[PDB]
Amino acid sequence: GSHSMRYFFTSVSRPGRGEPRFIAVGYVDDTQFVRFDSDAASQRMEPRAPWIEQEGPEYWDGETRKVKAHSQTHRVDLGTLRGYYNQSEAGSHTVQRMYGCDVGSDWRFLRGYHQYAYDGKDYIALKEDLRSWTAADMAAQTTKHKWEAAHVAEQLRAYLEGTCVEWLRRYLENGKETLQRTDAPKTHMTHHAVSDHEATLRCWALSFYPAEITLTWQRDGEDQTQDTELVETRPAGDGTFQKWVAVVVPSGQEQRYTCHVQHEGLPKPLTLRWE
């Protein structure tokens, strides 16, 4: 199926002394593969997956130079935005940037993206066509004008449709043993009595990859949303993911209820029942 490469960058200003805290992370699909943290000792881009260790010293020197350049743009941005919004030097502020590309089952370019936020609110984003910009307010509009005069969109489009796609394909090949492998959810169901009248059924999905999954309940063959609780999908810590969904039912009626699991690692969706 489809794949993605995405980079995420956060800078947080430190009023009173020194430069902002800067943290960069890179992902292929749901797998982290690189990081840079300005508070760490190395001041280098670091590997976070075994398959990226295949890359030579020139790659690591080049990514390091680029990630530091990213960090310096963010430092400057924090000063400019404080000016744009007439804010003081006292408070801590945040910039966030995300960019990357998607490819379909044929590993050809599908979509590209590049978005930016200031203090957790939309600031400016490249549109889907990769030709123009969405500016949220009048500050972002000034930036839009700057970037239009300098043809920034043109530079990004070239990266997102070219280099991004090229290197994602490269990563997918080098990391094929994990990156191109699906792990099906390991499912089971638990039971709790709340009182003499009421029971909780909880349907578990564990050890799955990628993160995308659907868990639903049915009663006598029809979808049930009322009296259900579905937790956010959460990392196990070993590269795989976890999720559950629970339903509250009248004691003795457990048999009416079935849990249904959809995941790319399952050719057929699966059904579970109590007892």
Partner: peptide, 9 residues
Amino acid sequence: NLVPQVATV
């Protein structure tokens, strides 16, 4: 592989 240039706001 990171983008080679990042424009400031």
